[model samples]
Target chain A: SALFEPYTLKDVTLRNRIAIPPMCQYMAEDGMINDWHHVHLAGLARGGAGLLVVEATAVAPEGRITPGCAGIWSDAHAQAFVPVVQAIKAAGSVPGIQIAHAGRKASANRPWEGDDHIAADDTRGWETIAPSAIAFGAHLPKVPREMTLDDIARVKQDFVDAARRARDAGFEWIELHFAHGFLGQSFFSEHSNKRTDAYGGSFDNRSRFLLETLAAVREVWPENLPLTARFGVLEYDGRDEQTLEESIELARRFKAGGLDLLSVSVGFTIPDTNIPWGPAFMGPIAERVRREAKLPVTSAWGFGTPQLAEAALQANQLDLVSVGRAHLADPHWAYFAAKELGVEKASWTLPAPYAHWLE
Target chain B: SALFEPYTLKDVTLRNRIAIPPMCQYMAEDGMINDWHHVHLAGLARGGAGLLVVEATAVAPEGRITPGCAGIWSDAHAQAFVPVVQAIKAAGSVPGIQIAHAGRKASANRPWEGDDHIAADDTRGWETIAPSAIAFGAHLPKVPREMTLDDIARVKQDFVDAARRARDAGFEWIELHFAHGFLGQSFFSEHSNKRTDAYGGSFDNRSRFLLETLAAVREVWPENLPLTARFGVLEYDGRDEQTLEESIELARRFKAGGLDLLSVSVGFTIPDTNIPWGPAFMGPIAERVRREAKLPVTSAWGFGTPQLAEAALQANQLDLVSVGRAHLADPHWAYFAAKELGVEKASWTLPAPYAHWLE
Candidate 1:
């Protein structure tokens, strides 16, 4: 039952260490989560992820990655996600939502078509923003509008409001989508941001936005619940880009800001041009970050297999392991993994209605 | 003939004002140009584009948006793209490449396979870097490692080295991939970069990375090659993001940094948030950047059509027009526009050797 052991952090306890990393379904319609989301998310819960991290849910209408990205800017948005979370909770998994403002990578086509730039004429595309007015190039066609002081204030408030809504919706964990090249990452990275105001100049200034936003979200995030910040620990080159020490230092900063865990990974801003397909390639980086940091750490890059996950846990390199596409392909990852480890019966299968006939 | 009129900027002159905007095919094999790129790029030249922007060519392998993107950081990398550029130039169209470091949005799968974050274990994927340590959620996984001072310095050198290769490759125009949510965009967007270091807090600091990169590239880029910076001029939701003024100011700054022209447009950072998409969504904004700043301007979104492109040019809103997807669907856009404008029967089609059958 080691896999099923409870892990406590702050005042909240997770039933197990198996956590579903935030996966963007690209399934929203007009910024609202639909039935598909409910089914998809509920399936994962039934499959036995100890903590199910919902897809990236926008903090505001303008915070979406695309027109269809999920949102919680409005009460209706919160209401819409309720059933999905409720189902996950009912299935014995703690539900979590990753909230974010996609900063510059906001408006573009869904992944199906070339995933190239979305034309302004496209019904689903629109303007995007960032620290400055740069595009993600081929993936995005339009340059983002630079944010003003007021814009910064509102973005912070949006995070706070979204947290409040997440609380109302009864989520157990809240992960700020700060790791990706969204609003928070823009503040963290040096390549996308160009400003001279209090919000732009120093580490204190750059960290100001996320820190303040974290504080804002913390105010309503319920002290009992765990608040986590997903961060890109270092640039892949292992050069000047965020380094291991810098990432650890950043973890310290986030911890100081009252963050509960540091989800360590890399390259959500710029694409990782040197990846070699396989599993556990990035486990070492996560292990490195965990070794250097004081807070709870999670490893997400390609560490989906149960063996690798167990190895990481046994080594104390990571407190949690996150899975995405694998869970989508097989919702019963946790259960199957448990069975593979020969630690439990394969009780959690397809829904009885769906599995009875197969059985 | 107005459309065919030559446009001059700095020391480079286009036979016609049409520009093939930088596009990312995400089809490079090991960051080297392949047959697809040659055909696609040659088609643009064959279709009568006066200038062909050869996509977001990564300055370094780690700078690419994906493993498949073309790169120019190595000597061997340059030769791969040389033929494509030569084919275009020989076809009488000026050849160009938008060099970029995708910063945080790096290390993800190709746009098709869900464009999800590339697991660090995924072959061909690596860590991504940006001004800060952030991730671009959804199709873009991988939180970029933040750039350290050393990483920043090395990246600048990478650009410089890549610029030399680009110059040798016969690129007449070198577009800095600054507009998209890539490395340049990551540094430019105030909302995405969260750093307290020199690069994150102030306008000067935030701009340091990008400006230095540009200056370094400019140092190597032939003075006559026509250096340009594509900038996002506005974000519709200014309340929580960068504004038009900031963008315009950035454009002005680029001009001071030796940039010859500013390809002006808006909306890459915000994503599918809320912003009306239209041919003129950025007309007013482009006009402002053009009018307020002294640099020549180019606009992209919705400029794919001849009518709008003409209107934009005639109105002095932009000096050049960047058309991407439309050009993909119809490479003879310039010809179509010329015919529509009642100009001479220019040979928009390819030469007999290349397009005898088509003709």
Candidate 2:
């Protein structure tokens, strides 16, 4: 089955239908992983996943989600993650991390901490940067200082540092956390960014941020490692946002710039309040983007069962199915499904204990 | 080892020292859980985790990390998560969910899809709401409307509804995702939230939103289900920022409102690029918050090892160790540790088939 067939991208091979989506832990303090990251990450490695994508680690300190989010912006950050990546590899799984910049969303609170727009009085929050001077809403603070060309250059350099750190940390793959309304998302959406400079306005201008960042990362990230970008296929109906055509073009450019695969998803300009949650909502968009891009697309939303994942893979609507909340819900769905389906070889990646329990 | 010991928060009991921290996987489309969520979440459950905190699920559609984030805004959304929660329970782990609203960060593209701030337009971008009328930065448009009193009331109601839905969905533990420049964080931060309304200014005013939301959530969430809140313990130092004292007061209020535990982390004022990536940056803040709040606290930062996790636990500095990226890197660290520590009878919760590998 196409779902079961191992696929290759650049120099990486996924052994099964499972791929750990890019999750942001925001756990680094001063750019280093502590004991919390070790056991936390190693547990997933031991679970026998095919490919483990670490959270969106910042390319620079300024690129972090909070003062505490993980960083690969320096050798210290890389050294902190070395043991983690090594442990994941030792567990017989491909280890990877999503490197990203929070852009305007940087220097904020952890997701659990309320995702608050921080002020100067807050101990960790600092000045945030984005493509434009717009705020996400009234609840957030006023316009941020515009980034000079020098700032852009420095930001790109951060990605390069992060990529090098990821390589030094022993990761075999690199996924850019380009999805979600983080820094990368800022450049992708025109509604948020109103810049007229080389980094904004026209499509070419809007693309500069992502392209430059990608180029910087590629320069440091070993070519052998699979370099991918998680993209939000636009589904909003408001101003200045990317349409499907624009999104497709973006993917094309990304691929040309050395993105190995496209992890496709969607983003609404509205808050989650308006978007109803369900299985079908995001799958089609993934399918749509996958079809248009003709790329090794990883569909992330609305996937829950072997049937759905298998269907997507077999139908070729998506080359890879991203298992997110469901995986968080049940870490052994693959193992259980193989048993229920009575596929002997399906147990290949099953942790020995799971097999023993069934026996 | 101290790290492997069971942890208790109020009435909740973790299987071991590891915590699948509240990492945000912005994979939802229109708030629904797809196959991607199932596998992504399930893999962690099967990997022998003690607790699995789901991503920051929104109480309403407008409360997402971005437009693409997951949500429990509707009963339909709860239905989508039923099987997912079941899977986690079956894997012998407590399933937890983080509820949130992306305040100023709402209405943007996925981090990778340019991460640009788009406005309501043909692509579905909609007008955003917040505490003030400030823009997030120079690149993003300043189009946010001040959240009306009605909006606040309605949003609070959404939290209650979502909490009920989570309970119905079989989630045993819940955490309010209040961090990272989201609605909750906005209300808490002095810089972002500038209203003179009951939900703004003074410590009491600023704490209103989170306290009201938590109280509302607690009203409907089953008493048996442990309810927690994630908070930024740090004070902002940038323009229009809230001081640490304000945050502490807010935490105290939430605690008084019956929050079971504190999943403490920082940020909400700065860009992701400004903060250095590492665990130390957040670890101290966590410790300080824990100390100040005098509540059970879960701290993640640079702490990624069992040894360090144990030390933290033994020292009584933290009640839970949040591991995000590390867990994504490896799901089976706990199971492996059990074997190595010679805890033959360790809950050995992994499915049967894979048990032998542990020996």
Candidate 3:
């Protein structure tokens, strides 16, 4: 029953090991969540997951990955999530939000809607900002506007503002979206950050923006709640060893900055990177981060299988298993995992209405 | 693939043959559905079912099986279902409701909460009404009040009012709760109805209340939409052959009275009946009703298994499969059924938010 065991981090305690990671649901309108999010999130929470993290919510309007991405740029947008947070908490799952800025990956169409850069003449897209004016190439062909010192300062403040809003909105867990080739990941990767300023070139410079943003967010985010970040420990673009070592060092720095846990993942820094994708491929990497960085960690991708989740937990590869797509396939996947793992009273993993009939 | 095929009954065309029958949640208060029903039903609608029938809704306050049962006795009570119906329609699922009167089984606790007749002195319990002043025995030990001619007319009017409200509130399909030992079932069963009036005794008289209710409802219910009823074809209490023959004959009369579909089930008329419970045990009974009565039929219990459902459909046993407990285990059970049956693009069984990521 390792997968069904409760997990406590700091003042917040998860009822079970299953964590629903932030998977972008491109259903928001003008950065405001609607019934789509309310029903989606509330239903997932009711499905018995211990943690239900909302999708990557852009910290700024222009930071959105698509027109459908959620945002917390204004009080109205932040307030839209209040009911959703309350709903999740009411269902006994910890509510978390992954505040993000897509950077060069911003101003793109929804994943299913062509999944490419918005047409230059399209009014829906605003100019994207990044460390350098580099294009991700292929589908995302729009070159980004290089950020200046003022832009850097502005974005860090945006993160702080978003963190404050998230706290006020009653989120117990806050994930700084530092992975998935977004602003934070782009700032830390050499492939994207070709800056000559102190913000780039050396490892300290590359890690500067992310670290400063995390520290600024900490100024507003409560220390009692779990302050976490999802970061790619290694990109499979032929520089795994060097990138992993630097990532580990940054993890140590993040831990020192009062961060509680890390979400290990593959750095989708660039396209066509031959990432050896397989079931539980990130287990060893996540374990390495947990061991060397000496911090509790979680990871996603291919761990949706109950056995894999259990194995990851038992092997100390992950403190929490984030099952994403499988939840999309079945919202009550935690219950499915419970049944699969032979947890006693597994049907009780659901609420009384469903559990009673299921049992 | 047979299970994934579209089905058209009257003016309503379902996207698939999967139907979610009325499984009472026992979560309503004052017969008004709240967020629990909203989230639960909406989530299930989005889980890929073509038809999602809201649980056995009481036609009147006293008709409620338990305090937690939903009702449409008042305009406000009927209005409470507006958003839920819209949510189901928005998810591309047909919204249906099974109007019910618990009869002798009324004033019972929730299935998980004792699941017996409420204590006699309990304020929550109400005096139940039936064709005869008889107890259903064990669990539901309350002897119901024998209905007067005026009571029959009033109850029939209640059904008519409920159907009108359901139609106005945006429900596209309606199922008369004539099954599972409820009021209508009790009226037709010789075991429960020992009445000398026109409502019981002979086969024609036993079917009078159900037929009359259907005829009254049709006056308000849209003729373009499917009018269905759930009927217990056999009791399995040593009178299977005769009961089923009589039930089939009544089904013919139902078809003559404009019934579009029959949900075949066991007559839980009395306790301690020797019902042979097993996977698809109701298939032959349902098939018999479908064939003999020459009407489309659906049945639940053990059809949650995808193969059984597909096999039932292929063998012409059921036109649609009602999956209950499996859906309680996983809301997107229709998607699971599609995958198990090797239907192509099975993940698309869900909405774009889930389907896109899953695919």
Candidate 4:
């Protein structure tokens, strides 16, 4: 079946088309990954997914989505992922990481812990940074401190250092987090980036930070490895056509700047936008970018159904299907999908310990 | 429904008859419980179980079933449980802990990690201790050191210290782990305890260790809180009748010594035994123990089925039904059971965060 077919990118080959996209577990301590991440990642790898991208890990402490988000800001923090990377590789799945900076969305509570911008009075709260001093304006009402040129340079270097650490720790695939209204995504969107400097204003200025960050990371990240990025291609904020046009142009430039794949997503730049949530909803937009930019692309947002994943892959909408929340529900959802699609030896999609009993 | 009925023992009142029994996660480090335990226990508590008895936690480092087993050996180790206890209480579930000594079963790999005795060549392996120097055989073939009178005293003191720490950590209910071929169960079974000392030989000698340990812990374990124990009342080792009679007599002694409840289970003393594993298989045996010993009791083994749990309670076979592996599959099994049993507001069986979305 198409979903079970191996896909080769650069020198790394995914065992299957099923990719476990970055999903926040919110179970870390001060940027260090622990046994929770070890067991969780290894378990998912054993479930037959080709690629398991860890949650949006912060490039720096201040870049973390919440206090509980994982981070790789220091050498010590990077060292903690050695065992986890080893375990994932041992389980026959490629380990990928999405280095992130939450930007204006930073200093928020965990999804279950009220999921808003933490109060300034809260000792855990810290000042957030963005392209402009604009607030995301909802639960995240705190106006962020606009990033100076020095701050922007430091943040880009942080991403480079994070990528270097990820490479040394044996990560075969690296994804730049430029989606979900995070640092890079916000800079790309006019809604969040109101700066008049070279990093904002026209489409060219808006794309500068993302292109420079990707170029910076490319120096340290292995050329033989798969280099990817997740970007919100469009927001359903009544400007879908214009947003898609700008995003497609950025995707093309990313390809020119050494990005191998693009994970297409909607820009959650502002909270008031209507998202027409449904199964396989992002397939058409992903197909549009893949065709226009001529880049391998993947998208997530309810592509959990076996038929949906199969249809998307067969129709060439997405080179790989990113199934997120469904994986959280069942780490072995790949095995279930294999069974549903009538793949031979479907139970073998899982590891021997689970498969032997399950068979 | 009978399954939704509240249960009270001593001063601890459960919101329902559902009890999450001790199921090992084997996710600790050097006997110290971390975020894995915290999130696991807290999440299970939030699942609406009336009582969540933590898995078999070692009273001493050497007594752990595996290196990853939870421990209350040192004051520092006990302090680790403070947050876990508070979280469970905050979720309205009476937190309880099962203090244990694996005896001959010590130094074994986690169930997923081979479920056999740790190889002697492995650096992590440790020598095990038991009533007599007999091996349980099969996968567990290492002959343990026979405990001398001093060793017995030290181990009993360990249990007392563990109980004291559990009390200090704010655990409202405590369970003495004496089941499934652990130290306490081995001492009670003639199959493992061949010693001619007071800890072995005749029924009175076999029962002495369990009774002495209970009495010692009762001094520090508050009288107002529930003091419970999980004991293997019958082993399917061709001596069911004799074993049941002896085990029931010991239950009476335990009740007389301040044990508020007994968790009835089968003795896994030897490798060669035909355990007729089926639904509600332990209900009749538990009922006999409750009636003969005049003590309230609970039993596990296949009571995970909603109908079986309801039937066992309605038929007066058990005071509380201990459900095991099902909780591992879904922490919110009680909510599922409540819905299956047609209880009012079944969705409310879980906490607001989960129930709000699930409803």
Candidate 5:
């Protein structure tokens, strides 16, 4: 029943604790969404998720992970999201979006279409940029261009522009994509950032890009709404204790700089790392961040099980359970969870047409 | 899998034999389906139903079962279905709709909203027309007006108009709704029809109205497309044997007049009937019709269970199993059925976004 409980953050109140985290749907065309994204998000929202966050949309054209990735770098591109936002709201779920810039991970093929960096001769491919000119080295083997000081400022301005566009498009919540080895996450990881300037080296310097992007976005983003971020709190590459300690420290700084919530995740900073992938494996790590940083936190990576989600909530490990792939498996996974957990009239967790026939 | 087999009828070839029957959503306003229907139907189509039939759409304004029932009596009203048809086709499902007239059941409240005849004083209520002036009794106590010969002619014209509109709106399949104690079924049944004229009295006379309506619709409906109807062959009112014999004869006549498929269901003609409702209860009757009438048949009522659907198909009881409520429970039910039945790469029954993450 804890999973079915209502959650209120600032001016918005979710109908339940279930949040659909951003999962990239590689179906966009030239940064414009079509009926595919419309029905996908709208249906998920209708499936009774309290918060339905859209996929990681690029802040700039070249920052896209693939040609299919969504972007809001222009006014026209941002306009495409208005109806999608309205559809999510109309389905009675809060709409949120993650504005992102894929650093070293940019210019790759879609997940099903090779899932590696596009060939150098491919016109679809673009030059990727990062903190340093390092190749991610496996599937994503592009040695990205090292960012100049102006490149850093331009990317920050792009993030701010993306935040403003998302706001103007009627999004109720915004999440800075500072996780999953993207631009911001790459800047903070020692393996990716080897620069000898103010933007690299010490913890504060490594954290500067992410912190500044959040602060710059905070100006245009309304204070009454929730400003969240999905950040990799650690890289499980045999540096668990040290990486987690510094990551938790950065979490504290994020909290101090007007961030409302943190979506706990592991750093995919490097391809070669040992991740203990299992059901609800991130629970303890998420719980630790929530406890140490004294901030509300949600974590993905196998919390889709109804019992696990409920148990996590009961143990005070997470403010909300971010269910990802399970939702892709079934947009109405929340309803399935409701029925599995024995919520009263659990079928009612769905819309009236479904509820009326189900029960 | 027997349920996973493809089926071809006329110019249409379904990817699978799972059909989503016409289950009303009661979400439309003045017969104009909005985002609610757009998403509800689009999601179901995307869920992998081989044939996704739209709900019983009234052919005339006064023939609506409730205010929320969709209608296609006007060009603009029919135009609203254009994008819906395209969405279904885009999702790789055959689009079909049941053009209907509720007859004596018209002007009732929505099933969830106190399902009874709307009071005469209520502006939402309208005078219902049928073969005779008898009321269905129990919850439906409004005595309908006995329709004149002119009224019958006009209604058939309306049906023909609705069929033409459906064809123009890009629907590849169409079903004339003649089942469940509706106008066409009421005319065929002896209980509500006491007319001494050509539309009642003997079995041949009673079938005149239905036969004529089908013939009229055939004029506008394309010959290459499949023309179908959902008919109740037995009332189950202590007269199953004789009524079913007559119904079988009518089915033969329908085939002679060009009915591609028959969705067999029990006649809910009167309130006092001891119809034994059970899971796949119509399997035997459907099988009999498919055998005796030598016509393809589909039926609903608890075929949502994957095994039941497979067994019915294996037993030669049905052509396509109409799965209704279960789809409302989970839109991706066809995929679930595939997984439950141990089909190879079952998740791929869904679209790329879902199938990719599921497997």
Candidate 6:
């Protein structure tokens, strides 16, 4: 019943607490979304989730993780999402998007395509940018171009431009992708951001880029809409406690800077770390952020089970539960979850066309 | 064990007996297959099926079932399949295609899009042609333009052209779309063909068109490759015995005219018949045709279950079991089947990329 309850933030009202977090579908072409994305996103929206978040869309072409990653750098690319956003809204689900820059992780092969960095001579490979010139190591061993002040300004502007375009395309919720060792995450982590400048040294400097991008995007994005960010709170790399405390302090700063919610996530900052992967593994960490920072929070990573989602909601571990891969396995997972949670009219979680026969 | 055995017809060999029969995706654009078809077909090929038959592709533009149907009407349209055929071969699956003309069932909506005949005013609707002008009735109520002798000749040539194109495009197997009350099926059934011409009236007349088309296509199609057909052998329209005897006779003519195999199916000529639908329901009928015509045969309509496919093969009910909808649900169904049947190294049923991780 808790999972089925309505949740409101700013002027947006989600029909239920279930949220579909961004999950990359390597089906784009030259950064443009097509019928593949249209059907995928619209179909998920029709599956009864209260909120459907589009995948981590690149803010700039060079920011893409793979050649197949969706981008919103140009007007043409932005226009491609118009119909998809409309379809999601038409299906009674709030449309959300996660704007991202893959940072040093950029220009890698698709997850299924060996998921390693492209060879140096490969035409598809591009020069990646980050706070430092360090390599992420292992499969992602390519050293990135260290950003100059002008490069930082341009990338920040790209994020602002992407947010404006998202609003123009009628997105009701916008998420700054500051997690997964991406551009924003790399700026915040000591492991990746080794710069001795104002952008990387101490905790304040490390948090600078994320805080500034959020503030810049907030100016263009509507105050009536929910503005959120997904940030990696900690990497299991020996420095967990210190990193988590710093991350929580940044979460406090994000709240002060007008972020409506924080999506708690693990930092895949470096290759060497022992992550305790399991069901509802992020619940305790998410609850810590929500309690310590006194901010509304959500988290994903194996919370797809109906009981897990219900338990997280009942325990107040998360204000909203983000379910990712499960949605891909079944777009109508919310309907299955409704049934599992013993909700009345469970079949109605899907649209009439699907529900009528299912009922 | 029989299910995983190799099957050979003429010069081509299938790695296993599992065949992914044609199932319409309704994702094409104005009769052209794009990234959707490319990824979909290639992904299925990677799933490790022995034979992967493409969905019904129109021999001519107007012959399309829906606007979304794939076509090989023009050289350009035929060229669209070049990459897909190569991808299938690259994955070690035998690439096959079903060339079709929807007849009276043409110009209908996609299965999920109402699954009814498009309205007269719909811009996507088109004129359809058949042996006679009769309508199929039910959801498909369009009365087709009866084929003039010239129209018949033109359509026969279209099939020939499609076959040549398919061969040039690297397809190793081809299927004549003679089933499900389409143009070829309607020509054989009295319910839709009321003409007194050589294409209608009696069994010999009805068998003429199919035989002529097969003979014409055989001329261009490589003799070393497998030439197959999917024909509705019975309508279950109360005249089952009479209808089947004639259908079996046609199958014999097909073999004589160079068809290497037959895909047995039901004639959905009219909506009033009880098909007795169940798991492997068409196995017995397919067996009858195979026995009577002395030809290798396959049938769909629910043979997706691993046990059913194995049983059908062991009992000599089918040479190959055509699995349709299940492949759509899980492209790696052959791997699932391998696992379910307790095959050693079952995960190896898929390509190395997937199999390595899955194992």
Q: Write the per-residue lDDT of candidate 1 for residues A16-124, one digit (tens) a residue.
A: 7889988776768877886446656765676677889888899876678776688998899899988777777777788888999988888765664445557878776
lDDT of 6 by residue, A262-302 (tens): 99999898999999999999999999999999999999998
What DockQ results do all the predictions give, each relative to the true complex? 0.01, 0.01, 0.84, 0.09, 0.78, 0.08
Instruction: Give the alpha-carbon lDDT of every model.
Output: 0.74, 0.72, 0.93, 0.90, 0.94, 0.90
Model 5 chain A: worst 10 consecutive residues (lDDT sum): A350-359
- lDDT per residue for candidate 4 within A265-329, as digits (tens), equals 98899998999999999999999999999999999998999999999999999999999766654
- Give the 10-residue window scoring lowest on summed lDDT in candidate 5 chain B: B350-359
Model 2 per-residue lDDT at A112: 51
Ranking by lDDT: 5, 3, 4, 6, 1, 2
Residue-wise lDDT of candidate 4 within B1-359, one digit each (tens)? 88889998989999999999987778789999976677667767877889999989999988999988999999999999999898889888999999999999999997767989999999999999999999999999999998989999999999999999999999999999999999999999999989997888999999999999999999999999999999999889899999899999999999999989999998898989999999999888999999999999999988999999999999999999998867655556788898889888787887543454345
TM-scores of all candidate predictions against the true structure:
0.49, 0.51, 0.98, 0.75, 0.99, 0.75
User: Can you give the lDDT of residue A108 in candidate 4?
Assistant: 94
Per model, the share of native interface contacts recovered reads 0.00, 0.00, 0.91, 0.00, 0.70, 0.00
**Per-residue lDDT tens digits of candidate 5, residues A1-359?**
99999998889899999999999998999888899999999999999999999999999999899999999999999999999999999889999999999999999998888999999999999999999999999899889999999999999999999999999999999999999998999999999999989999999999999999999999999998999999998888888899999999999999999999999998899988989999999999999999999999999999999999999999999999999988877889999999999999998888887887777
- The C-alpha stretches of model 1 lying farther than 4 A from their native spots are A1-359, B240-242, B270-272, B346-359
Note the clash tally of each candidate: 131, 226, 0, 0, 0, 0
Residue B85 of model 6 has an lDDT of: 88
Worst 10 residues of 3 chain B by lDDT: B350-359
Q: Is candidate 1 or candidate 2 better by DockQ?
A: 2
Top DockQ hit: 3
Question: What C-alpha lDDT, on a 0 to 100 scale, does residue A93 get in candidate 2?
Answer: 71
- Which scores greater on lDDT, model 3 or model 6? 3
Q: 1 or 5: which has the higher TM-score? A: 5
Q: On a 0 to 1 TM-score scale, where does candidate 1 land against the true structure?
A: 0.49
